[PDB]
Structure formats: C-alpha cells, structure tokens
Amino acid sequence: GMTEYKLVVVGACGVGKSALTIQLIQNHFVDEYDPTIEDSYRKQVVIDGETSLLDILDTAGQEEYSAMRDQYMRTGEGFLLVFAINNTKSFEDIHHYREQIKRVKDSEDVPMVLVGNKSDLPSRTVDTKQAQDLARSYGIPFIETSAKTRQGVDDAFYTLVREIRKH
C-alpha cells in the first residue's frame, strides 16, 4: 500500500464536519448534506514533500457506543474537534468529544486540532480567546476555518497530519 493517515472529523450536528471534508476532498461547498450520512473519503496530498492518502472519517449517524462504533472510532490516528463560531453549545460539546477520544485511545496524548468553523459569518457567539484558552489547556493547535470560502481548510487537516507525525 502507500502512506495513509486516518483522520476523524467530530463535533455537534451542523458545525460543518461534512462541508470541511467535502471542501478538502472535492474543492466545493455544499449548502446542505444529509446529516445522517457517515462515510470515509480518500485524497492524495503532498505534505512537507511526503505523498500520502488522507482517509477522512466524516462522523455522523447517531450517538451510540456499540463495540462496533468504538472499534471504528479507535482506528482514527488524529481527530478534528469542530465547533461553529455562531453556536455556543457546539463549543461546550468539545469537552464531550475530547472525553470519548481520550476514552477509546486510553491516552491524553491523541493527535487533535481544535477548529472554529463558519468564521465567514457575522453572528459570532464564541470568542477566539475562549477557543485558544481551551486549545492551550489541552496542548493542541487551534485553526479558524470557513468551509464556505475554504479559508483555513487545508491548514486544519495538514496541521493534524503534522500533529500525528510528532506523536
């Protein structure tokens, strides 16, 4: 085979998990994608000169903790923790996602990037300072993104790959 990084995108319903994934893989913006569709998407990239497959698990379906679901999430080598800057509950839920990754990988040392998505919109309810304070407490990078304009999208996924090489 060839070099593969298995990245998992997690976060509340509507934060832009699918929009970020599709912008990365297919370079276009979807205004509404079935919230129940959970798939992995593959794309060849070159990062700091290394050619690899990104296998991106776009988390969806429903909240459950079957042995099947746990095994599937455990294969994730790195996690994008996505919240939307206009949705305060999505930011609060970051702690939940962090807990469950901590749980299945039995470590506080899992590669993760915090992503503040929908940075294009004017209706901010979560300040960047709060997001950076949280990222600092976990020891992870924080990226501002807009899946709509593609600003920060490659930055977020490539940073997560770099995070996985270090660990």
């Binding site: 319903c13 909240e63 459950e64 609060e92 949280l134 407490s137």
Partner: protein, 219 residues
C-alpha cells in the same frame, strides 16, 4: 413601624415543543414496570452539571476558588410527599431553562418514542439524552430551582398538560447549582423510603464519581 414588605416575580409561560409534549403525555399516562430508573436519570443529570464545573475550571481557574464540595443530596420528605435532588453543579441561566427544558432535547425525543414503539424499555431514555422527562413516571409536578454564577435564581415548573413556567425565584437562596423537586403521585410514595432509595442507587448509578448523600428525617 415599616410598610408591608412584598416581593414581585415575573412569570412567563411556554409551550413544550410538540414532540416533548407527546413524550411527556406517553410517560405520564402509561405504567412502566422498570420506572425506578427515574432516580438514576436525576443523579446522571446532576453528574453532567458537576462535570461542567470541572470543564470550566480548565480555562477559568476562579472556579477552583469556590469552597463548595461537588456532591449530590437526596432529600425525601414524607409529610410533603416530595423527593428533592440537590447538586452543587454549574447551574442554568434563564435561556438554558427555556431551551434545555422545552426545545433542545428535541432530536432524541422522536428517536426514543420510535425506540419504545420498536419494543425498547423506558430504561433506554437516558441514552437518548431526554432522561429528565422520566421524572413524570413518578411525579405529577416537577419544580427545578437553579443558580448560575453572575445570574439570578430561576424556578421552572410543569404539571405536564403541554406548558411550563419560568420565573425569577425570590425564595430561599440555594447558591450555585440545581434543585429538582418531584411532587410524587399518591401511589408512588415507595420512592421516599430509605430502603427503596438504597436499593435503586445500589443498582443503577454504580459508577457516578461524585459523593451521593441520602438525608433521612428521624421519626
């Protein structure tokens, strides 16, 4: 030689989202053999609120400065026929009550009623994030008193029938956290017995990692 003191409270009435009202009508009207799980759902919700204190501590260290223990207290009252659950968690803002307890629970609401139609047990309610409504298995009325730092004390109240109220609470100050008061149905006073409560908590909650204390009134 003073004038008559009198407090004033603004009260607002709200409709439940249609699907929460359907679930509440199903819970109130139907007998469930496994209804003891209501107490596990109250303790689990207190646990979520106490976890929020620790999360906030990560980025706001002033949380560390409170001298309050993080704990859950169970207080049966046979005279009043009430079961009260008190925690020292983060508490809710007024926006939380109007939203958390009458709209935001909406997605697992429909999914839980289809699970019940499919033959699932009432005990699965907690996995759909709507465990709070299990209080209506054993209570004809629920009051929630809550205090969030930098906000006022609020009381939420519903006897089901499709609406709830939220008011500023000028009563007994409770300090940071949430108090849930179950006004038990006449036929559900078993859940005020020290022995029944000890059985239920010995069985269901198992691995909640905050102290739980039962207060028994000496007869």
């Amino acid at each position: 030689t003073q004038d008559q003191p009198m407090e004033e409270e603004e009260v607002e009435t709200f409709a439940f989202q249609a699907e929460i009202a359907q679930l509440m009508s199903l819970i109130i009207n139907t007998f469930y053999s496994n209804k003891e799980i209501f107490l596990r759902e109250l303790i689990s919700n207190s646990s979520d609120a106490l976890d929020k204190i620790r999360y906030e501590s990560l980025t706001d260290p002033s949380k560390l400065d409170s001298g309050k223990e993080l704990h859950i207290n169970l207080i049966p009252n046979k005279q009043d026929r009430t079961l009260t659950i008190v925690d020292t968690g983060i508490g809710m803002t007024k926006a939380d009550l109007i939203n958390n307890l009458g709209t935001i629970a909406k997605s697992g609401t429909k999914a839980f009623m289809e699970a019940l139609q499919a033959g699932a047990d009432i005990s699965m309610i907690g996995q759909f994030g709507v465990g709070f409504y299990s209080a209506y298995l054993v209570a004809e009325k629920v009051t929630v008193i809550t205090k969030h730092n930098d906000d006022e004390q609020y009381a939420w109240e519903s006897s089901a029938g499709g609406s709830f109220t939220v008011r500023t609470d000028t009563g007994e100050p409770m300090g940071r956290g949430t108090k849930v008061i179950l006004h038990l149905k006449e036929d559900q006073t078993e859940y005020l017995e020290e022995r029944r409560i000890k059985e239920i908590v010995k069985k269901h909650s198992q691995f909640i990692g905050y102290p739980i204390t039962l207060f028994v009134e000496k007869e």
